[PDB]
């Protein structure tokens, strides 16, 4: 009721006066108020729908006036001249309008004047008068800010010649026409400033509370960074099924990210996405930028520093139905139920934001974001903004040549191309060996789909061909491959149809067996490829589709290739620091940080020798299919030999065309004619090479006709005449040729006898031939490996009556029935000591795994002084009766069993075994029949007469020790085998289904 009429606004409160009874009708009016505030942005007052309205606000520290009397708006802007309006002092505004002529005045001095357009002269408002705030702004015309006020307002008046509306007073005192949303004190209270926060690490985020606006709403905030990439705000909907070419999880979402400098609003309301670049200029200069995003249904505006951009979502979709958390500064990892959509490139590239943020408003209301950061207890956030003293890279904090780069308050290091990893490149990175028959496949947990990727890795090979990395999909031909092709690195992106694959090449002579570093960056249609620190190669894919489906990431071999009928060759070499969208897969695999890893490659560097093969005679050779000619040639192989003369390779063509590799007086000769005549390049070594060590040999002829012979570490290069390289004709001979052929080989070839020794790692212009299997013909004997012939079975190969079996790589010993473990059944096998008092081990088959067999077999080792004891006992289920039992009775071993007819017993009467020394017993059953053997006595075998049941139904438990049967065993037992189960071992490995009970201890040796 009192002298002067003041009110305090805090961003959630506003007045709202109903003009509908008494419309404003003004051909001349006057507006007056004093404000007090610290905020760059806030709505003081507004009135009007339609094209008739007055809107007065503080907009980036200045006073912003828009009037429109119906035929065009007037727009004024008063700036402070020596100070700031948001200095938390009072400031007087006065608007005076006389027909079309507007005049505004801050503090009596600061003033401008102007006119509204065409010839309309009256303001007409039958709706609401809003003071201090609004329900929103995207529905309130000519409104530059969306933010509610945060300060004090007094003596707010609107008058004209007729009515006088003292809106400030009416508020305090109350009026049927007046309404106040929220709780407001009617003096001037101080409005707390909203402290800024910094996002120090990418991964630091915050959960903001749910954005409620379905149709219409806003967000405003300020940011500051030199970081070119970072996801700022993101929220999404709830899975609505069916992207009708790949089968993804579709969802409603919106996002604000930074990519490569520029800032983007993304939005998708049901009918597809729209990516809108929110300002043409890069905005990572480290200056505070204000963003105001408001929307009214399917359209809306985004603004950066008073510069607006209209946007429309495609479709007929008016509602953006967000549901759960609203994210700020980055996203949470391994959070169940979160979908990273493909269009938000940052999300899936793991580019969290780093940099300052402040003054967050949602739907007009201000939000204390420092406050949330203390309640959530979020790591990686600090409560300030400090554009720091000195770039951090000065300290040179990045070890082993890692490229430093200055970010917002942190050094950032790129340690690809250094063999290390980790923030500052201190953790040395795992290496992987492949011998052409090895792979390493990362089957991801869930089907990815990406529009952008970073993919980097290091390689090293003597081969000029082979797959480095490739993404594969169980459902299509889609891939992103790097491979070596003719000494070059070849990126290939291919996306299934429904005009073909897009390729990009980089670098040369890279099969030098020094490391190289490949770097791929894709961003939709844009491809970019850099080898080592050469010049980046770019390419722009044609074709409108850009989305890549992939279930797994492969190296070494491309295993997943249903739809391809042909594939790059397997890899021979070493990889390091494979990194895919932030993920260091090799390193994560070795350390066991991920389940979904599958490989038969090996960790750590090793001089590779790929599929060695022995040519036992000189006259031993094999014929392969013709060398594929044609443009350029890259031959590689290695060899071991005691002999100083022999022909290793031969293939001829039309006329005098041929190519040959031979060993002559221990030195390696390359010899050929490609239409100019016969030529000879000698391989460079000092010593003869028949030194029984392994040597590397690489012959090549590029399309510039430059021939290279390498031997171990030393190149020799030479030029040759420019003759169109031509098809070869004959079979390709390796290790020799036919006997009569030596009499008429090209003069200038020396050899009169074939190669004898080993050959390994044969690469024939991209082809890794199995020399034995892929052979078209063989002569003499060619055998696998380079270690002499493999061991074969003899009488005394295995021990303790173990069965010697022949395998491809030598013999083995089946120890099952022998009681002993180890390669030769000479090692002891797992033993349990049964001590005084009695005890018992018990296996219980899970209820639905109970085996019913037709033929059984069981073997055990033991020692005891007892005359009466039960040892092993297999019982069937309750109410079934079928069983099997091994026992000592009157000092002699015995076995008793039953499958559903009468009981059946075999005994060994001869061998006394209650003698304290080690014995072994073997039993077998087929139906009624059985056999029983002890140590090396002759087998006892029984056959009961007449009809006999034959299945041992529903085996339920296995009991060792006899205790239950009231005849406990004292002594030792080892090496129990029953129907494939090495039970005592399973006991010793704490098997889930074994309960040990009583005085039984394991003997650990
Ligand atoms: C338990 O052992 C008895 C006797 O060892 C098994 O019966 C016998 O099985 C053999 C081979 O299956 C029979 O040999 C015969 O040889 C001729 C000539 O090639 C062939 O044409 C016949 O058809 C037959 O296979 C033999 O007749 C048979 N003797 C009998 C039934 O008295 C019995 O199968 C074994 N039980 C189990 C469950 O393994
Ligand atoms: C280089 O600069 C950074 C400060 O961000 C510091 O962490 C290091 O100690 C210095 O090597």
Swiss-Prot record:
Glycosylation sites: 395, 929
Disulfide-bonded cysteines: 152-188, 356-385, 393-404, 398-413, 415-425, 589-597, 758-786, 793-804, 798-813, 815-825
Binding site for Ca(2+) 3: 882, 899, 951, 953
Occurrences of domain EGF-like (ranges): 389-426, 789-826
Entry's Gene Ontology cellular component terms: cell projection; presynaptic membrane
Function: Cell surface protein involved in cell-cell-interactions, exocytosis of secretory granules and regulation of signal transmission. Function is isoform-specific. Alpha-type isoforms have a long N-terminus with six laminin G-like domains and play an important role in synaptic signal transmission. Alpha-type isoforms play a role in the regulation of calcium channel activity and Ca(2+)-triggered neurotransmitter release at synapses and at neuromuscular junctions. They play an important role in Ca(2+)-triggered exocytosis of secretory granules in pituitary gland.
Subunit structure: Interacts (via laminin G-like domain 2 and/or laminin G-like domain 6) with NLGN1 forming a heterotetramer, where one NLGN1 dimer interacts with one NRXN1 dimer. Also interacts (via laminin G-like domain 2 and/or laminin G-like domain 6) with NLGN2, NLGN3 and NLGN4L; interactions with NLGN1, NLGN2, NLGN3 and NLGN4L are calcium-dependent. Interacts (via cytoplasmic C-terminal region) with CASK (via the PDZ, SH3 and guanylate kinase-like domains). Interacts (via cytoplasmic C-terminus) with CASKIN1 and APBA1. Interacts (via laminin G-like domain 2) with NXPH1 and NXPH3.
Protein name: Neurexin-1
Organism in which the protein naturally occurs: Bos taurus (Bovine)
């Amino acid at each position: 009721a009192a002298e002067e009429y003041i009110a305090t606004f805090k961003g959630s409160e506003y007045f709202c006066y109903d003009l509908s009874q008494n419309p404003i009708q003004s051909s001349s009016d006057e507006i007056t108020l004093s404000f007090k505030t610290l905020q760059r942005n806030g709505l003081m007052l507004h009135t009007g729908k339609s094209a008739d309205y007055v809107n007065l606000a503080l907009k980036n520290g200045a006073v912003s006036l828009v009037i429109n009397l119906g035929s065009g708006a007037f727009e004024a802007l008063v700036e402070p001249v020596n100070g700031k309006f948001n200095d938390n002092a009072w400031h007087d505004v006065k608007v005076t309008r006389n027909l079309r002529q507007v005049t505004i005045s801050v503090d009596g001095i600061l003033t401008t004047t102007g006119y509204t357009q065409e010839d309309y002269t009256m303001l007409g408002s039958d709706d609401f008068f809003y003071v201090g705030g609004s329900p929103s702004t995207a529905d309130l015309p000519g409104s530059p800010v969306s933010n509610n006020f945060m300060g004090c307002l007094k003596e707010v008046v609107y008058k004209n010649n007729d009515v006088r509306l003292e809106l400030s007073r009416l508020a305090k005192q109350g009026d049927p026409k007046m309404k106040i949303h929220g709780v407001v004190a009617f003096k001037c209270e101080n409005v707390a400033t909203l402290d800024p926060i910094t996002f120090e690490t990418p991964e630091s985020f915050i959960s903001l509370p749910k954005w409620n606006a379905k149709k219409t709403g806003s967000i405003s905030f300020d940011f500051r960074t030199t970081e070119p990439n970072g996801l700022i705000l993101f929220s999404h909907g709830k899975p609505r099924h069916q992207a009708k070419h790949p089968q993804m999880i579709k969802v409603d979402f919106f996002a604000i990210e930074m990519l490569d400098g520029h800032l983007y609003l993304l939005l998708d309301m049901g009918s597809g996405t729209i990516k809108i670049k929110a300002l043409q200029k890069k905005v990572n200069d480290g200056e505070w930028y204000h963003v105001d995003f408001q929307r009214d249904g399917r359209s809306g505006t985004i603004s950066v520093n008073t510069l607006r951009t209209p946007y429309t979502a495609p479709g007929e979709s008016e509602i953006l139905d967000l549901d759960d958390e609203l994210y700020l500064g980055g996203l949470p990892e391994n959070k169940a139920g979160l979908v990273f959509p493909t269009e938000v490139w940052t999300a899936l590239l793991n580019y969290g934001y780093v940099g300052c943020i402040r003054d967050l408003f949602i739907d007009g209301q201000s939000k204390d974001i420092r406050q949330m950061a203390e309640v959530q207890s979020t790591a990686g956030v600090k409560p300030s903004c400090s554009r720091e003293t000195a770039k951090p890279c000065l300290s040179n904090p990045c070890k082993n040549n890692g490229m430093c780069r200055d970010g917002w308050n942190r050094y950032v290091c790129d340690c690809s191309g250094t063999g290390y990893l980790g923030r500052s490149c201190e953790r040395e990175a795992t290496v992987l060996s492949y011998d052409g028959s090895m792979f390493m496949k990362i089957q991801l947990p869930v089907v990815m789909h990406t529009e952008a990727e970073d993919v980097s890795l290091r390689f090293r090979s003597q081969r000029a061909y082979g797959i480095l990395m490739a993404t594969t999909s169980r459902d299509s031909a889609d891939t992103l491959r790097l491979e070596l092709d003719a000494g070059r690195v070849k990126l290939t992106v291919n996306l299934d149809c429904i005009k073909g694959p897009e390729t990009l090449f980089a670098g040369y002579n890279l099969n030098d067996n020094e490391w190289h570093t490949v770097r791929v960056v894709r961003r939709g249609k844009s491809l970019k490829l850099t080898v080592d620190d050469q010049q980046a190669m770019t390419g722009q894919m044609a074709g409108d589709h850009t989305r890549l489906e992939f279930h797994n990431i492969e190296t070494g071999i491309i295993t997943e290739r249903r739809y391809l009928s042909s594939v790059p060759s397997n890899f021979i070499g070493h990889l390091q620091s494979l990194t895919f969208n932030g993920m260091a897969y090799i390193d994560l695999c070795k350390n066991g940080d991920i389940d979904y890893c599958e490989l038969n490659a090996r960790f750590g560097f090793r001089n590779i020798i790929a599929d060695p093969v022995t040519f036992k005679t000189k006259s031993s050779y094999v014929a392969l299919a013709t060398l594929q000619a044609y443009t350029s040639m890259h031959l590689f192989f290695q060899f071991k030999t005691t002999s100083l003369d022999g022909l290793i390779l031969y293939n001829s063509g039309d006329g005098n065309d041929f190519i040959v590799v031979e060993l002559v007086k221990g030195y390696l000769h390359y010899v050929f004619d490609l239409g100019n005549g016969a030529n000879l390049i000698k391989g460079s070594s000092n010593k003869p090479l028949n030194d029984n060590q392994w040597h590397n040999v690489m012959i090549s002829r590029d399309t510039s006709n430059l021939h290279t012979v390498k031997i171990d570490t030393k190149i020799t290069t030479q030029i040759t005449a420019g003759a169109r390289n031509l098809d070869l004709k004959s079979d390709l001979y390796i290790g020799g040729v036919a006997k009569e052929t030596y009499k008429s080989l090209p003069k200038l070839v020396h050899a009169k006898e074939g190669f004898q020794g080993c050959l390994a790692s044969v690469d024939l212009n991209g082809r890794l031939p199995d020399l034995i299997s892929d052979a078209l013909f063989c002569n003499g004997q060619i055998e696998r490996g380079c270690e002499g012939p493999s061991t074969t079975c003899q009488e005394d190969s295995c021990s303790n009556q173990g069965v010697c079996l022949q395998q491809w790589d030598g013999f083995s010993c089946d120890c099952s029935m022998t009681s002993f473990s180890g390669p030769l059944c000479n090692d002891p096998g797992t033993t349990y000591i049964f001590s005084k008092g009695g005890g018992q081990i018990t296996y219980k088959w899970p209820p639905n795994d109970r085996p019913s067999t037709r033929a059984d077999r069981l073997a055990i080792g033991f020692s005891t002084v007892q005359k009466e004891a039960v040892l092993v006992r297999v019982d069937s289920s309750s109410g079934l009766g079928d069983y099997l039992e091994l026992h000592i009775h009157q000092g002699k071993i015995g076995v008793k069993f039953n499958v559903g007819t009468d009981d059946i017993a075999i005994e060994e009467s001869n061998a006394i075994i209650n003698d304290g020394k080690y014995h072994v017993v073997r039993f077998t059953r087929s139906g009624g029949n059985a056999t029983l053997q002890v140590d090396s006595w002759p087998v006892i075998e029984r056959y009961p007469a007449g009809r006999q049941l034959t299945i041992f139904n529903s085996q339920a438990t296995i009991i060792i020790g006899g205790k239950e049967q009231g005849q406990p065993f004292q002594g030792q037992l080892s090496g129990l085998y029953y129907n494939g189960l090495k039970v005592l071992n399973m006991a010793a490995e704490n098997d889930a289904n074994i309960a040990i009970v009583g005085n039984v201890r394991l003997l650990e040796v």
